[PDB]
Design a protein around this ligand. Structure first.
Ligand SMILES: [Cl-]
Ligand SMILES: [Cl-]
Ligand SMILES: [Cl-]
Ligand code: NA
Length: 124
């Protein structure tokens, strides 16, 4: 049974590459992180920074989350990210994703002790 912090790591951290350099990155990563197991997760962002750098966002700019909560934090700097989105022709179990690489500020919700990211809210 997965902790919220561990779920964030599994869904959103990819420190092993500096960027998505292939159109098939999302198809491979959504599968290997078990985000296509019982259904195709429609949208998911991977962050290509160290875990420490992403955890540090919880001490950066405090902003509102989309849902009105006030435990969201926006990174001061831009980060390398890859947005993965199901294509219109995708449907389980043959999940298919579009890969879009970008450099953007990330916004995460943080909780707990230690105070760490538990939800990916958006990128700007
Ligand atoms: Cl898993
Ligand atoms: Cl996401
Ligand atoms: Cl402020
Ligand atoms: Na947790």
């Amino acid at each position: 049974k997965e902790t919220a912090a561990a779920k964030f790591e599994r869904q959103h951290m990819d420190s092993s590459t500096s960027a998505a350099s292939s159109s098939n990155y999302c198809n491979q990563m959504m599968k290997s992180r078990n985000l296509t197991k019982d259904r195709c997760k429609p949208v998911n962002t991977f962050v290509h920074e160290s875990l420490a750098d992403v955890q540090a966002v919880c001490s950066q700019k405090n902003v509102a989350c989309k849902n009105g909560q006030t435990n969201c934090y926006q990174s001061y700097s831009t980060m390398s990210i890859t947005d993965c989105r199901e294509t219109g022709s995708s449907k389980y179990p043959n999940c298919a994703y579009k890969t879009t690489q970008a450099n953007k500020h990330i916004i995460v919700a943080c909780e707990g002790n230690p105070y760490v990211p538990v939800h990916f809210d958006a990128s700007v």
